[PDB]
Design a binder for this molecule. Structure first.
Ligand SMILES: CC[n+]1c(-c2ccccc2)c2cc(N)ccc2c2ccc(N)cc21
Lengths: 186, 186
């Protein structure tokens, strides 16, 4: 595809190399297009990036839906969502590229611009879970927005910063996490 | 000393221009040494950075050892240590050199022998906190090593991924976390 097949390119240059570890010229290579095709939908490096981000976060949010089904109590949705967060091939596989981006481009309205849209969807699944937790009364939080951002990131840390130790060790830890967190709420 | 001098010039160069752009030639010139004497001491840029990384980790351990008398109980140190991490990393100079490096040497097994031992150093502080909390009966945790691991990375995510918010709110979520998390141990 025109400006669509190009999108799947950078995605890999970012997951395979990082943000400034991949450039337009680069893209253009396996891309095979002109530095104007990008002009249209992709105004700047940031855009292309901030764009691919959300896209992927969505394939994730989508898989999450087509999967939570195997969880009864919301509390199970919690443990699960975090667990799955570990195995997906979506979004998280370029959270380091984002760590960089957070620096290389923070003297510029993008963080809260389009990147604020992501910040929302990124903590949505948690928001539901927690919110619907008050209903089912599995617990009860008086600031669901705070706890939601909290959970989201911590979990994201457990996923990002431990990508070295074997995959099964990881799954165990994350579960010992959810136990503690959920238990710290009620 | 000529070693320290290298380490001294090297650090600022990295702080002034990131990890990637800083060349050893620069380091040797401004340190007034020789690639020879340099190579003898560190063998590589990658390796040089690591040693600075370690020297820094030891300076951290220092601050923590002094700045922690302001926290009587282990339950308070956990609160203090966490806040401390957020604030200091808000304006940590090398912060950008670090991110470049972790992205510049992810899969590299070798650079990961020390890479981990160092990381392991930050996890110790928590480990210490939790064990002491044990001996005192502030809580009860047997798999200290697991919690310590979870607390380190959970916090890191809270600190790293929350960059879009004002330092007042951040310190708020972080203290909220510390309370919630710490609340799932008794
Ligand atoms: C947890 C290790 N760790 C730290 C770190 C955290 C606390 C103290 C010292 C270093 C880190 C710190 C910054 N700024 C940026 C990236 C990373 C990172 C990236 C990947 C990884 N696999 C472990 C990582």
């Amino acid at each position: 595809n025109l400006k669509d097949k190009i999108l799947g390119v950078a995605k890999e240059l970012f997951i395979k190399n990082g943000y400034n570890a991949t450039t337009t010229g680069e893209i253009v290579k396996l891309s095979e297009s002109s530095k104007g095709n990008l002009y249209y939908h992709f105004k700047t490096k940031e855009n292309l990036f901030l764009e691919i981000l959300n896209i992927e976060e969505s394939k994730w949010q989508e898989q999450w839906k087509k999967e939570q089904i195997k969880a009864k109590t919301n509390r199970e949705k919690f443990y699960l969502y975090n667990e799955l967060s570990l195995t997906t091939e979506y979004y998280y596989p370029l959270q380091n590229a984002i760590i960089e981006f957070y620096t290389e481009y923070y003297k510029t309205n993008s963080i809260n611009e389009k990147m604020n849209k992501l910040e929302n969807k990124y903590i949505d699944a948690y928001h539901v879970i927690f919110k619907e937790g008050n209903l089912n009364g599995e617990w009860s939080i008086n600031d669901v927005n705070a706890v939601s951002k909290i959970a989201a990131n911590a979990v994201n840390g457990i996923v990002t910063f431990t990508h070295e130790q074997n995959i099964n060790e990881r799954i165990k830890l994350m579960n010992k996490f959810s136990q503690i967190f959920l238990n710290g709420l009620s």
